[PDB]
Amino acid sequence: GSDPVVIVSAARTIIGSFNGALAAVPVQDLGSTVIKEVLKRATVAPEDVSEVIFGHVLAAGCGQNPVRQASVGAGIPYSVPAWSCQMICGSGLKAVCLAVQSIGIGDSSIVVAGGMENMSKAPHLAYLRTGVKIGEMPLTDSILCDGLTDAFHNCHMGITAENVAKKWQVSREDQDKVAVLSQNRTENAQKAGHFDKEIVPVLVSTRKGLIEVKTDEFPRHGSNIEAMSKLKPYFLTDGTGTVTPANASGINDGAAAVVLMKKSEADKRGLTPLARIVSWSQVGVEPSIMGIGPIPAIKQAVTKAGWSLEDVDIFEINEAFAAVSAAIVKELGLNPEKVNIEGGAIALGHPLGASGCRILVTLLHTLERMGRSRGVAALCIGGGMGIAMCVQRE
Amino acid sequence: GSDPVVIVSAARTIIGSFNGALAAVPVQDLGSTVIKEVLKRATVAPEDVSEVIFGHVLAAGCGQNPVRQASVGAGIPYSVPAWSCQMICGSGLKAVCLAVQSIGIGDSSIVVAGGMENMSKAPHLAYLRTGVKIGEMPLTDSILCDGLTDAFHNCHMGITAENVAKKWQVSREDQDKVAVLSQNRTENAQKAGHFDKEIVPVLVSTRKGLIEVKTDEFPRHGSNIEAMSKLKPYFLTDGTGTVTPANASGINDGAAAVVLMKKSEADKRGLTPLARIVSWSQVGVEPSIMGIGPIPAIKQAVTKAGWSLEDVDIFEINEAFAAVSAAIVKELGLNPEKVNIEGGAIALGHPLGASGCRILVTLLHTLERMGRSRGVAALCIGGGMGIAMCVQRE
Amino acid sequence: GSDPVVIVSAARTIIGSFNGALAAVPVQDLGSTVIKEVLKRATVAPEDVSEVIFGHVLAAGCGQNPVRQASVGAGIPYSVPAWSCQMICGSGLKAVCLAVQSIGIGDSSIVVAGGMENMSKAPHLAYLRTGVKIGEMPLTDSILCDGLTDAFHNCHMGITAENVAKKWQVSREDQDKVAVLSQNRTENAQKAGHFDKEIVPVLVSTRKGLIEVKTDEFPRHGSNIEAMSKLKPYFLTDGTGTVTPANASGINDGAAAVVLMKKSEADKRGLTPLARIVSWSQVGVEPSIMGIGPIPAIKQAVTKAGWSLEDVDIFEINEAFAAVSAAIVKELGLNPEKVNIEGGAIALGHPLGASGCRILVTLLHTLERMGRSRGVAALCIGGGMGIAMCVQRE
Amino acid sequence: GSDPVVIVSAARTIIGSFNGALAAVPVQDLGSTVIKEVLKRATVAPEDVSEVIFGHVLAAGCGQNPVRQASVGAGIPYSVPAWSCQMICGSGLKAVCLAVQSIGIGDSSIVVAGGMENMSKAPHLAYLRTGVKIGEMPLTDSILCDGLTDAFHNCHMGITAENVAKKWQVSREDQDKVAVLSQNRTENAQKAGHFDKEIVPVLVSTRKGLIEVKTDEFPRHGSNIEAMSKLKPYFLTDGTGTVTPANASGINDGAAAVVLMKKSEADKRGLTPLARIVSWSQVGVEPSIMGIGPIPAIKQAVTKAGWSLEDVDIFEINEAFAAVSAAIVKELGLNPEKVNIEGGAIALGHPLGASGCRILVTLLHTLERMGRSRGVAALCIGGGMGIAMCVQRE
Ligand SMILES: CC(C)(COP(=O)(O)OP(=O)(O)OC[C@H]1O[C@@H](n2cnc3c(N)ncnc32)[C@H](O)[C@@H]1OP(=O)(O)O)[C@@H](O)C(=O)NCCC(=O)NCCS
């Protein structure tokens, strides 16, 4: 307001498949890759960064404060504080919102915010300190334990998606249609080169030598409803299920970042931003239907912006599950041709801590490419939250 | 400033010994205990909380977003967002600073901030997804991997303490003197009932039934230099070492929380706060000497407050290691009778994510009890950071 | 027959409680202790041993061929072959029977046979070579998996004991009476010094220095039916159960050995044996009632010896469970004052691979002490086998 | 002698590659496959078996007495005892020798002996009962710990092979020549159908349905010295090494069995045996050079038979390593055209507990096919043993 926070640069790694192209890359190196790149793009020297704030969910085995490792590994000096936030799938967007606060209140001048996740490298967990006299002990999967199981109902996120499918009357067929659309949109965007600008290559050391990875790995080209219709429901297997691996997001690896500063600071520095941040919201809802978090979050953020829903040109609403995506669109009455137009996480994947920033990166570049003005990024969050941000092209 | 953020209530659990009195209590239940209690103390209804922000470091195996579990378990409704921050040992104080920002900028009205850690429940970690054809695989200790090993130099925090002992010329004898002083101060504070007000009991289900735990477990009463002088250095064993288990903080379990709002909101509600928050700082330093983080952090925060160091009545500077505590005091020229006067983490323990809020809780209650005005809380942070806050009794 | 196999010396370690006095002693060192000792007792030089044959059940993590480690560690030269047999609880007696065959057929002149088990050191097991994409994996307890669970019915040995209790009509009260009797007999034998001769001390390296362990650890002195009557059934918990920890054998650590040669060789060497081996048997029965294996085994061995059951002066029948012990006695019509007169495994413990030789050692020394002539040793075996041996004092 | 023990039938599974074609088949099912088949081949009813004796080394996680599981799973009644022997790589031949003793002394009439191993299914091991306060714990590979590491020198079997290569002056080039010869011989034998008779197919349940596996998986067709010459030494990496994966046996899965009875019993039953057993030996040597065990074992067995080495038509000497094979041949002065003429374990693989019987099976069928008379089977054994058997075609 008058001197709003603006986003000057925005980049992401490709999103790797589970146990795929980025699996050997430590999360902090994904982070360093995007941090160094957005600073390069913005022509901001690393010593001028006030702080680094990253979302990161599955941090077991990553060492002490992996965000600080990422910062230093990007060339940011030890003098610059760096820290993480966790708000499950909202984390990478929450990082951006935190930067908005720190800049807006006058504590920070330039913030690199983002998110990062290497789910392939998430470990299994054993509790060994008591010592089991006699009997089996579990090696628990941290992805399931800490990432994907609701704490209140002890059910997978996909069961919450089934809850939303039932309550919002999103059929199996509806879900597969949304999934095929997401796949086809991503394939089209890829062929057209729409992600070239946002992607920064990742260097991977291989037996055959160092290679660059610069194409998203998760999309299933030639996706079709006939093939999707044949799959069995994965999460709910009692004959009433609807969610399958083809209409759900994946488990994936990736990172994304943005450079933020006040408009006045961008002006001082001769930088034209991608967009100004208009508003943001965080909300709470019931855990059993966490997927609908974006409904109140978007409504609140749009209201705070002084907008109507019709004023929004482009939405990125994270595609946790087709059932959930469809419910949000249906309830809000959104035009599908304005929502996830480059495809979403069904096709692209969902590295938990990264996605909230990844979708913002894609949004900003879509607004830019299409010469549209107003955008919204929003995500649901396990345990019953939502987060949303309104941006306007500058 | 004019309408500053104020702290209305401040409470903590006891600090449990490693594999001790709180070992069976999930971290989120420690969190719920303090959250519910500070709201009770402040006479603030849980539905009036804007958000909950907690520090938490070792989150493996704790389930989806343990801070949200803690919030809901305290009686805060699902409508209230709850999330975590990680900045290693600074996390619990960072949570408070984040609340200052959210309130100060106008996003939140009332925040419950704090920190929590159950180190006893930290798991061991195994990477199982590739699958080892042939050979040994480690079960890595998450406390060592993620909590206590510097990422840049692959050394324990205690080696960084040895680095500081050498550079700031803090002898073995100096360190044991500081440690005995800390022990004796805590024992005196305990006997005098100085922690009664701040402590909230924890309920623990036992075979013999439910019991309340309301005394700190870690202090070693009757500590003396003769006994401490006999121990061997633990971290550096080549004959030049100085840090032992008796002059280092412990591995421990606990939680702490505070209720924050604007002065105007406290006034509206007829609440007299414990203190107003004057300033805070976060800084970066070299990882090899991370222990000295508080030197620049305190200097910056005190300067921001418009104070001189002599104006500060009481300091809580987390006692990660006696070597580090002594170095900070020596460099800054502080009066030991103004620093950690109820004892510190050598005696009381150091649950990573909780300590930054725990020391603030103890500080506020010391200012209150002694009728003193100005306080500073500060911590070092692994990877080379410092964080500090200035408060003034209201 | 004419030139029978004879046993010249017989010794055992104490039996350690689970995670108790012998828990830090590798199984092969228990073996070495008894092997070296029976050779000393027999005045047979280690280079004169033909081969070493030991029972051993739970060999995971013990290294390559632990019996060879035990042999060499006892001072037997590398020129002497050493190997193991596994027949679950029968293993230590089977080793002796194998020695009878090798000597009797003329392949070996002098054999050290025995059994050994360190159950405390049995590891947990994880299958890691495929690599689990996503999901929990068990750390399986090798004692349960490989030692104590029937392969055919996937039930604990204690469920087979319940099967026998039901079919042979051995009540809870009957079982506790047998258990108290076993405890009291062992306590009496201990007080009277009856085990002094057979026991060889084990050296254990301790922080406080090296100590000798020379008392059995498992007995519960002052055992009584009032206390036993209060315990709940452990294995079968649906209200029809009868087997509890107080009327079942333990999980334990120990080793035992014997030196065998032909009578003519003992005569040549001027050695008076403890006894001659008269006969032995191995049999199969239904796995669900494996505990009754000794009924056919004893009958067959006694028949092979040309004896009647009344001719047998002393029986050692391993006390896997009181239910099983009682069933054998009842079916065969044995005099309880001739069966397990020094107590049995309820009081003394049951290191799987050792027990078959341990009971033989105790039998031989009881015959000797009491100046009685004919003895039988017998055990049940998981999966439905029995093994028995008839001996006669020489 | 006069009424010798004879072998009536002899069969084996294919040998599967590590984590290959048999990896999903429990070891006991491999055992059942061969046991049922040799009884079928011999036209001996399962109820007429006296006992079953199998070699088996890596038994962790296989359940209670896997040999009894194999026996029952083959259709042998519960009345028939079944048990295992362990003498590392000698185990499967030791089982046969034990059967010779039991039959020869008159205890058993018909024995099914053999060996079995599923190395793919060998677990990793963790010691969890004490409980590690703080620090890493290993998941130890049972194959390395229990199978392949010498207990006396803490070195791999391949280091013992390097010891033998040095002492017996077997160069890298010598070793690769032996390895190529083994590969080529096996490839020739395969093409010619020489293993068709001995192999019994294994049924494997697959997603695509049940399939039969009937070809050995490990051979490397088209093996050549140019390719082998390029590989680096695997075990000894200081520049003096010679043993590589191409001149060493593999880690593998398989089982083998034989049916034994007296000649008089075969005559009674109208069965023509494959061969009579003439003699056998077991010996001990130094662990550092365990590979040379067969030298004294073969010499002793041949002497016991009343033979000269020139009288032996065909040798199977297990190819643990080319270095070791070559040393034995060189020292004994054997004709290579009489040794391992169908190839050996370099090409075929080495399932530890199975190999001692597997080579006997192959030997018997080679004698039969070629119409030759006298054979020797021999193996080295970790920890410094050797075992050998002389057979003569009947
Ligand atoms: C569902 C999940 C476990 C993946 O399961 P998986 O068994 O590895 O799934 P795969 O990728 O192997 O796919 C399974 C099948 O679906 C098929 N499939 C997936 N996408 C398809 C597509 N677009 N078209 C056709 N078939 C497809 C695969 O080909 C495979 O078929 P197959 O069995 O014949 O080989 C994982 O993606 C998941 O948990 N997603 C949700 C993550 C989550 O909850 N995030 C938080 C959101 S709040």
Ligand SMILES: CC(C)(COP(=O)(O)OP(=O)(O)OC[C@H]1O[C@@H](n2cnc3c(N)ncnc32)[C@H](O)[C@@H]1OP(=O)(O)O)[C@@H](O)C(=O)NCCC(=O)NCCS
């Ligand atoms: C050092 C550490 C590993 C504990 O080690 P430990 O071996 O469990 O230490 P213990 O509590 O068993 O104490 C070890 C010995 O010191 C003795 N000791 C400890 N405190 C003592 C005291 N005040 N007076 C006398 N002796 C004391 C104990 O009695 C014990 O003696 P013992 O060997 O005779 O039994 C752990 O406390 C630690 O790592 N602390 C640092 C945590 C950290 O780095 N936090 C982050 C900071 S940046």
Ligand SMILES: CC(C)(COP(=O)(O)OP(=O)(O)OC[C@H]1O[C@@H](n2cnc3c(N)ncnc32)[C@H](O)[C@@H]1OP(=O)(O)O)[C@@H](O)C(=O)NCCC(=O)NCCS
């Ligand atoms: C049963 C078993 C699991 C031990 O269980 P556990 O829970 O460790 O048993 P404990 O030794 O702790 O004893 C449990 C209780 O019984 C009590 N108890 C045991 N022996 C007793 C005795 N003689 N008098 C009174 N109480 C006794 C203990 O005091 C303990 O009481 P508590 O709960 O108040 O502390 C184990 O001994 C076992 O599995 N045995 C069978 C082994 C086997 O099957 N071998 C193969 C045979 S075929």
Ligand SMILES: CC(C)(COP(=O)(O)OP(=O)(O)OC[C@H]1O[C@@H](n2cnc3c(N)ncnc32)[C@H](O)[C@@H]1OP(=O)(O)O)[C@@H](O)C(=O)NCCC(=O)NCCS
């Ligand atoms: C050596 C051992 C660890 C296998 O190691 P590994 O790394 O899995 O070996 P691989 O089968 O992957 O072969 C390694 C390389 O050798 C090559 N190689 C193996 N056999 C070859 C052949 N006949 N011709 C050409 N190359 C060959 C493989 O192609 C592979 O080449 P690559 O690196 O380019 O892919 C294992 O076989 C072993 O330990 N053997 C000994 C077992 C033992 O000691 N038994 C007890 C005896 S006392």
